[PDB]
């Protein structure tokens, strides 16, 4: 319906705003675009489903997220991929793991403060009716 399309449009606006705020944070530059395969040639082999913030924006625009829960699954994926691909105690690995956890924590904190629970519940109920 018109009510439901308006709901999902608002969801997309909200998700773009959150994602933009993550993307402009200097700490999260490494997560803004897909990896350069010349920098990490084995990434395609090691990481089952790559994810990055530009891909998240594309998915928002393709109407791939019908709830904030679905969106957070991809944010979680960005983080979990980083913990998986960079496991070692070397400072480089520790830096990116810290940034990955910070990205995840920042997204969840923004959502905690700014997402109305009744809006999310409406999204979830529309999604489950399809
Ligand atoms: C197995 O590879 C890792 C070996 N240890 C050092 C790691 O690099 C640490 C950098 C990563 C980039 C930074 F900004 F976060 C600062 C710490 C290695 N891991 C990775 N190395 C390089 C990249 C990368 C990919 N494309 C473009 C650029 C400029 C850099 C990445 C990217 C991702 C997403 C990742 O998880 N690990 C990387």
From Swiss-Prot:
It is found in: Nucleus. It comes from the Eukaryota. Residues 108-130 form a coiled coil. Residues 3-114 form the Bromo domain. Induction: Up-regulated in breast, uterus, colon, ovary, and stomach tumors. Induced in breast cancer cells overexpressing NCOA3 or treated with estrogen. Down-regulated in 5-fluorouracil-resistant derivatives of the colon cancer cell line HCT 116. Highly expressed in estrogen receptor positive breast tumors and in osteosarcoma tumors. May be a transcriptional coactivator of the nuclear receptor ESR1 required to induce the expression of a subset of estradiol target genes, such as CCND1, MYC and E2F1. May play a role in the recruitment or occupancy of CREBBP at some ESR1 target gene promoters. May be required for histone hyperacetylation. Involved in the estrogen-induced cell proliferation and cell cycle progression of breast cancer cells. Belongs to the AAA ATPase family. Interacts with ESR1 and NCOA3 and these interactions are enhanced by estradiol. Interacts with acetylated lysine residues on histone H1.4, H2A, H2B and H3 (in vitro). This is ATPase family AAA domain-containing protein 2. It comes from Homo sapiens. The gene is ATAD2. The chain holds residues 981 to 1108 of 1390 of the full protein.
């Amino acid at each position: 319906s018109m009510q439901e399309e308006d709901t999902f449009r608002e969801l997309r606006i909200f998700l773009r705003n959150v994602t933009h705020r993550l993307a402009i944070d200097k700490r999260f530059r490494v997560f803004t675009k897909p990896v350069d395969p010349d920098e990490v040639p084995d990434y395609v082999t090691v990481i089952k489903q790559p994810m990055d913030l530009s891909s998240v924006i594309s998915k928002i625009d393709l109407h791939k997220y019908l709830t904030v829960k679905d969106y957070l699954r991809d944010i979680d994926l960005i983080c979990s991929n980083a913990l998986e691909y960079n496991p070692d105690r070397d400072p480089g690995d520790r830096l990116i793991r810290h940034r990955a956890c910070a990205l995840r924590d920042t997204a969840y904190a923004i959502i905690k403060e700014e997402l109305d629970e009744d809006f999310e519940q409406l999204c979830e109920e529309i999604q489950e009716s399809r």
